[PDB]
């Protein structure tokens, strides 16, 4: 489905990349996107897929556009446009300067100080999940560890009850794993519908959970509205789910296929934080974007007001112009540059929580289950979109090589 080429887009910049079903996807999703960085592909191209939009293909342009919020607005951040148009999460759908105070409030509840009182539940959570799988000699890592882990952490951050996990999980999957049964807007309303009463409850009777802080916060002078509070809690919920689920999956798929990298981390556990950083670069997975606020020439290319531009956070660290031999994982890589957590005013607020979740997972898994493999005969399937991922991750190990800890 190739949308008619707008008159202002020259034909030499056309490259019909499909972000939801890239060709060569079977070879790995990062590799599928990296086709945009082969030598005969311009720094900035137009695809007619998914309604028609620009794609910046190089770290320098991706970073620049993310810095220039005046021209590249978060008001419509998703492709296709209809999804971008409905989306009203806070602060991701706002531009500076109104975004600033909402980001400050969100930061209180997911920021670096909060990551200390949570560490213990994160550690405990990772250990009991791993210990439950360890004697089986197999799991589907995506389903059995990756999925339950971040939602359980969010419940403890937001002071919500465990029994709600399955309902909430059903709601969020309906939003981010579309089978096409309902529109983005439709799924989002279903989600808000759960959240609306909880905010009502916690505005009248506030506690000390993240939802209570948000719903009773002060922004831009005055108290936050119930509408604003819902739009914030919606994003605090979903922001840390698919990203962490899919990232851990990519990481574990790599370690399962790489005994030498496994052993490196087993022999030298102090290298885990650095290995986390290099995996973050290599298996970067987010791609959202911006909408042009005005006509604007960007690196020799005429962009038109209302044009959408995909600015793939994924691509910056895969750019061979900023990391030599980018497809190779080197835990001893000396200057690891990436925009995996974004760039500019919307830089991931959960990046510190995310790193703890990743580092704790790797530390605790390698200690209990040092030697594991991809199940024999399994072909690992990837999916591509705004948050790329792993369909399933069947792993196997000999329980006799494991230790209860
Ligand atoms: C591997 C894990 C994660 C990755 C790769 C990731 C990636 C990103 C990216 C690329 C953005 C920028 C979006 C944009 O500019 O439009 C972002 C923003 C954000 N992230 Fe994450 N994220 C992760 C985990 C988390 C977690 C655990 C949380 C906490 C619940 C979280 C909360 C947020 C929030 C609230 C924003 C919006 C910041 C703003 O608009 O000012 N993220 N993340
Ligand atoms: C034109 N056409 C026929 C169509 C074709 C193809 C698909 C279509 C879809 S669609 O169903 O594929 N589009 C909806 C998919 O987007 C889900 C992502 O939102 C989840 C919330 N995540 C964040 O807020 C995040 C905000 C930021 C950035 C990331 C990571 C994290 C932080 C959380 C996302 C809908 C309608 C039409 C479609
Ligand atoms: K919008």
Query: Residue 42 sits in a domain of what CATH number?
Result: 1.10.630.10
Query: DSSP secondary-structure letter at 271?
Result: G
Separation between Cα atoms, residue 249 and residue 246, nearest integer Å: 5
Protein residues placing their CB within 5 Å of the ion ligand 3: 87, 93
Separation between Cα atoms, residue 363 and residue 130, nearest integer Å: 11
Q: Dmax of the chain from CA atoms?
A: 65
DSSP three-state, residue 260: helix
122-140: string of b/e by CB count within 10 Å (b at 16+)?
beebbbebbeebbeebebb
Six token digits for residue 72: 């590249």
Residue 337 near residue 324, CB atoms below 8 Å: no
Closest CA to 341 of 325, 317, 309: 317
Atom of ligand 1 nearest to the CA of 77: 16
Backbone angles phi, psi at 396, to 5 degrees: -140, 150
- For residue 292, what are the β-bridge partners? 72
The rounded radius of gyration (Å) of the Cα atoms in the chain is: 21
Distance 99 CA to ligand 3 centre (A): 14
**Ligand 2 site, residue 243, Cβ cutoff 6 A:** yes
Please pick, among 350, 353, 366, 389, the residue that the annotation labels catalytic: 350
**Ligand 2 site, residue 366, Cβ cutoff 6 A:** no
Residue 309 near residue 289, CB atoms below 8 Å: yes
Give the other-Cβ count within 10 Å of 380's Cβ: 18
Binding residues for heme: 348
Six token digits for residue 82: 């209809």
Mark whether 177 is an active-site residue.
yes
Backbone angles phi, psi at 397, to 5 degrees: -155, 165
Ligand closest to 291 (CA) is 3
Distance 330 CA to ligand 3 centre (A): 39
Separation between Cα atoms, residue 102 and residue 384, nearest integer Å: 30
DSSP three-state, residue 53: strand
Six token digits for residue 4: 């008619």
Backbone angles phi, psi at 101, to 5 degrees: -75, -35
Long-range CB contact pairs, 185-190, < 8 A, 24+: 185/86, 188/86, 188/87, 188/88, 188/234
Helix axes 184-204, 226-238, angle to 10 degrees: 120
DSSP three-state, residue 44: strand
Separation between Cα atoms, residue 242 and residue 173, nearest integer Å: 9
Six token digits for residue 205: 């009777």
Cis omega before residue 58 (within 30°)? no
Long-range CB contact pairs, 298-301, < 8 A, 24+: 298/44, 298/61, 298/64, 298/65, 298/71, 299/43, 299/44, 299/61, 301/13, 301/44, 301/54
**Where the chain is broken, by preceding residue (C–N > 2.5 Å)?**
none
Ligand closest to 384 (CA) is 2
- Experimental technique, in short, is X-ray
Q: Which residue has the tokens 């620009």?
A: 54
Separation between Cα atoms, residue 146 and residue 397, nearest integer Å: 17
**Ligand 2 site, residue 239, Cβ cutoff 6 A:** yes
Mark whether 172 is an active-site residue.
no
Atom of ligand 2 nearest to the CA of 288: 28
Spatial CB neighbours of 73, under 8 Å, sequence gap ≥ 6? 95, 290, 291, 292, 293
Q: Which domain holds residue 300?
A: 1-405
Mark whether 176 is an active-site residue.
no
Residue 25 near residue 384, CB atoms below 8 Å: yes
Distance 348 CA to ligand 1 centre (A): 4
Mark whether 350 is an active-site residue.
yes
Beta strands in 203-286 (DSSP E): 218-219, 222-223
The structure was resolved to a resolution in Å of 2.0
Mark whether 240 is an active-site residue.
no
Residue 328's Cβ-side half-sphere holds a number of Cα atoms within 13 Å equal to: 7
What total of structural domains would you count in the chain? 1
């Amino acid at each position: 489905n190739l949308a008619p080429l707008p008159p202002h887009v020259p034909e030499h910049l056309v490259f019909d990349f499909d972000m939801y079903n890239p060709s060569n996807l079977s070879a790995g999703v990062q590799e599928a996107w990296a086709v945009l960085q082969e030598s005969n592909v311009p720094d900035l191209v137009w695809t007619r897929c998914n309604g028609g939009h620009w794609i910046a293909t190089r770290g320098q342009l991706i970073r620049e556009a993310y810095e220039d919020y005046r021209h590249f607005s978060s008001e419509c951040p998703f492709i296709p446009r209809e999804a971008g148009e409905a989306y009203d999460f806070i602060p991701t759908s706002m531009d500076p300067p109104e975004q600033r105070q909402f980001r400050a409030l969100a930061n209180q509840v997911v920021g670096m100080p909060v990551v200390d009182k949570l560490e213990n539940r994160i550690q405990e959570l990772a250990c009991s999940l791993i210990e439950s799988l360890r004697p089986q000699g197999q799991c589907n890592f995506t389903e059995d560890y990756a999925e339950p882990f971040p939602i359980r952490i969010f419940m403890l951050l937001a002071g919500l009850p465990e029994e709600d996990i399955p309902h909430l999980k059903y709601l969020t999957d309906q939003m981010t794993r579309p089978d096409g049964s309902m529109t983005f807007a439709e799924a989002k309303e279903a989600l808000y519908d759960y959240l609306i009463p909880i905010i009502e409850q916690r505005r009248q009777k506030p506690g000390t959970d993240a939802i209570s802080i948000v719903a009773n916060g002060q922004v831009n002078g005055r108290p936050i509205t119930s509408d604003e509070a819902k739009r914030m809690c919606g994003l605090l919920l979903v922001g840390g789910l698919d990203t962490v689920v899919n990232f851990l999956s990519f990481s574990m798929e790599f370690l399962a296929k790489s005994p030498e990298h496994r052993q490196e981390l087993i022999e030298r556990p102090e290298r885990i934080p650095a290995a986390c950083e290099e995996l973050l670069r290599r298996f970067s997975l987010v791609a959202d974007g911006r909408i042009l606020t005005s006509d604007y020439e960007f690196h020799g290319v005429q962009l038109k007001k209302g044009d959408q531009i995909l600015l793939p956070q994924m691509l910056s660290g895969l750019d061979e112009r900023e990391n030599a031999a980018p497809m190779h994982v080197d835990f001893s890589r000396q200057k690891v540059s990436h925009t995996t957590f974004g760039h500019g005013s919307h830089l991931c607020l959960g990046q510190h929580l995310a790193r703890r979740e990743i580092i704790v997972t790797l530390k605790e898994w390698l200690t209990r289950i040092p030697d594991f493999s991809i199940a024999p005969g399994a072909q690992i399937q990837h999916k591509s979109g705004i948050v790329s991922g792993v369909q399933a991750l069947p792993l196997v190990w000999d329980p006799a090589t494991t230790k209860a800890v």
